[PDB]
Amino acid sequence: ARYDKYNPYGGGFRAPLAADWTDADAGKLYAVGINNVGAVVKGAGQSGVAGVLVLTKGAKAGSIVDVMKFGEVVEFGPTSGTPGTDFGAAGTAYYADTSTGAINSTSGEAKVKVGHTVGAQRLIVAVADGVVDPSPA
Amino acid sequence: NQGGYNTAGDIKYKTADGVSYDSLWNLFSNVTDEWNKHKSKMVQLMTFPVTNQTEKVPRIGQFGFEKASEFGVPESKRTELSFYQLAYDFEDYDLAFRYTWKFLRDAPSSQIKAYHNQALQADAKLIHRKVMEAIFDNREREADIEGLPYKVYPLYNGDNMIPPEYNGTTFSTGHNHYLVSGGTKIDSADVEMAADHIREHGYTEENGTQLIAFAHKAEIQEVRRFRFGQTNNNSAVANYDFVQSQGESPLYLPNADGLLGKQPQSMWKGLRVKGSYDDVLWIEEPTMPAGYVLFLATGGTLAQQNLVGLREHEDAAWRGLRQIPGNQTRYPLIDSFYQRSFGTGIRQRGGAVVLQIKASGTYDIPTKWTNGGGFE
Amino acid sequence: HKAEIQEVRRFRFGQTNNNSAVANYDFVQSQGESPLYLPNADGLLGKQPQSMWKGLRVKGSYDDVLWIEEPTMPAGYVLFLATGGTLAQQNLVGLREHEDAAWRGLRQIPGNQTRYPLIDSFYQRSFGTGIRQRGGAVVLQIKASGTYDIPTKWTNGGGFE
Amino acid sequence: AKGVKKLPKRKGTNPIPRDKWNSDDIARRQLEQDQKLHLTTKGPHTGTNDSFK
Fold it and tell me: Which residues of chain A does C117 touch, with a Cβ-Cβ cutoff of 8 Å?
């Protein structure tokens, strides 16, 4: 995954990273939230899911990261795939697991929609306000 | 070989029937073997002096356009570099003469000059074997340059180095220039396959190259018989025909009456040329082992420098054939050493093909040109 | 593509080819091809084909058509094309470009993100293609049965590369 | 000009075709070198005959 369209004024925001991100996460996409200190964590923080994040190289705690809420991500595939070889299905919705921050196409009542794909490799990021269904039947 | 110390008792006589032992050794004081003159010529037309101990070959990725739109903006494009790299091997070789004090007192000085001349011959034999090992031994080697290890390569050998793309042709891993004919006698099909395995990498007649095939006469005596659309060995049918060179005798010409085109040159680099097939010149190579053909590109934009690099030491004090003063000095024993240092590797991994004529199984290295098998 | 040229150069008058067809002409190789033995001292009736056409290299001729090895050509396809003469002074495909010179050629456009934190730049070209001389060429596909297939590398809407 | 060469033909008596080779040129050049490996001598006229077969 890579950022391709990002808008600094209300499309995303700066925040400090709560923990080190290792180079094993380089080029992966995660859904992210804010902890009670005001720093970025994978999955929902206290904030719920705030946005999505990609780093092109590993980064230390307390470094500043550009979280995306609205924009486009290219070279996209699910968080569990290998970056740059494994890619999304065309035309499908994508959902964050709020516990791990992992993104895949499987919908679920407690998951948060992060976007949908326009062809296999481009994700239109547009993060939902809350979970897919807060009142299951 | 005889070997050991030179001793009194190896001096057979001062004279026999009025002929001096000194005057016999004086004959051999300046002789050179006519085969060693040929081996030296083959090294000269098949090697270049290595100036750079390592080669790096980079490539760049590529991208395309997108269809435009009235309001929105394009996806972004990036590209990345990557490279292969190749090095040249290096090795040291030694020889000795040892004497007793009685021998140096009593022996003719002409025997010492004859010995020096024979070491200077054994040098030219060594370099030729190590140049031919570089081509025929289908195995990778390692070299250290500035303490970094590098791979040293033969031709393409079924390894994971992917050949460069050429004219939109994209090669895989496992590309291989050590070929087995799959039949007991050479086909036109085999010759055609082997020449095209070169020409797919560039090395074409449009690039200005000439292909040469060096073979033992047992294979040339098949190849001279290939006629267009006629059957050969192993039921192959020849897609071209063998045209004898301008100097070959008229009574060898086939049952034909005109030639479309021009006959091949009679001589190339001072070697006699038998003729050509598929625009490859065929040359009988005196050193070539029986069941093998070497196909080699020459003289284009590509292949403008010869196939094999000769690496030598960076300091002139360590280049050439050198005499070392030895460490038994003057009594009772004396010794002296000769040393030669160099090594070999191939940059143009696609610029030649080795074809072996056998019915089945994998390629064999010719015994005479295996690494570790000996020194000539 | 060379897979078809390696068949075509073997065609000989009155002899039989791949699908039991008999050749109504022989293939005659150009000057600068590898030499060939001929049954007769005069050998050839008529004139041998040119070695080079338009800076491309010619293999030879069959039925007075010049044959060219073309590395861009997909495997099972041949393009036959008329050139020169009274018709066909003008090439097969027209390139349309915009009427105003300010909008012709490859152009750089400065991009909406300018200096900090992000920077953009764009390249644009606009053009299109059509044929007038609808009879000026033929495409032959080598397949055993059924309808013509467009080469996947050249289906319209398949890609930009 | 025409692209065809007329091949040569038999003219009543033909020189015998013999194959030139690179190997045979080495052997000939070695033989004319080896021809120098001779010493002139005194004959049987030396009081010993151990050199003679």
Answer: 8
